[PDB]
Amino acid sequence: MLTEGISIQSYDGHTFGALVGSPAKAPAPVIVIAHEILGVNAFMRETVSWLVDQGYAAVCPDLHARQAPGTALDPLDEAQREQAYKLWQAFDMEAGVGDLEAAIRYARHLPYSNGKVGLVGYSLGGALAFLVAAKGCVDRVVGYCGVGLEKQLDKVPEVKHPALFHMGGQDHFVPAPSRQLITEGFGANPLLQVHWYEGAGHSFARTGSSDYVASAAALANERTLDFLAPLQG
């Protein structure tokens, strides 16, 4: 689901929609949400609503629009999961970072903006979140369960603003050697935080997922809100 009429244009003229949640009160910091491989779906709607309840405005851009505009896949359906994996396989990460940078610029100039923008990414979005953190166009970044962070360690010293990452300790995408590499690499830059949730799998924060772990999701989400709160005012 997207908000009708919202259009954001990227570096290369590509335009895309977004689900936008205006804040309860103005002004407010704006949070750009980088979605999972499944697109702007029920979990994204939930995430928008949550952040609005917590004193933010939120913008979730349609990152699949270069291939398939309005993608919103339900992870309960095998056919829709398969669609999502096909989209991820072909997904252009660099164009995703560009689209997110455009959404951040858009977020900054919303009429209720207090001038501060954050970025929260989930899964696909968590990997994009790290790449955006390295680019530095955003005030604070949060990434949940990003894949392949261990291959982006050269970018650790490029991060010049705070970034916080939540990772499952039983995430099959991040086995022990990868966790050790990420832990040691990210540890070199005190602007970064990486928290591991022992006993939690890849989609531990996604309500409805068989991976969901309430205690882990609760602690991660509490840390996220405390990390974003400094943007408020």
Please give the domain boundaries of the chain with CATH numbers for all domains.
1-233 (3.40.50.1820)
- Using CA atoms, how far apart are residues 141 and 158, in angstroms rounded to an integer? 14
Look at the block and give the residue holding tokens 């001038």: 115
- Using CA atoms, how far apart are residues 165 and 145, in angstroms rounded to an integer? 8
Q: What are the Cα distances from residue 109, in Å, to 8, 30, 57, 101, 230?
A: 12, 10, 12, 13, 19
Helix, strand, coil percentages in the chain from 3-state DSSP, rounded to 5: 40, 20, 40
Q: Strand order in 18-21's β-sheet?
A: 18-21, 57-61, 28-34, 113-122, 140-144, 163-168, 192-197
Q: What is the resolution of this structure in A?
A: 1.8
Residue 49 makes CB contacts below 8 A (sequence gap 6+) with 21
CB neighbours (10 Å) of residue 77?
Answer: 11
Chain-centroid distance of CA 166 in Å reads: 11
Could you tell me which of 198, 200, 137 has the C-alpha nearest to residue 163? 137
- Using CA atoms, how far apart are residues 8 and 19, in angstroms rounded to an integer? 11
CB neighbours (10 Å) of residue 191?
Answer: 16
Backbone angles phi, psi at 155, to 5 degrees: -85, -10
Catalytic positions: 171, 202
For the chain, strand residue ranges (E) read 8-9, 15-16, 18-21, 28-34, 57-61, 113-122, 140-144, 163-168, 192-197
- Both tokens assigned to 38: 């499944």
Look at the block and give the residue holding tokens 């689901």: 1
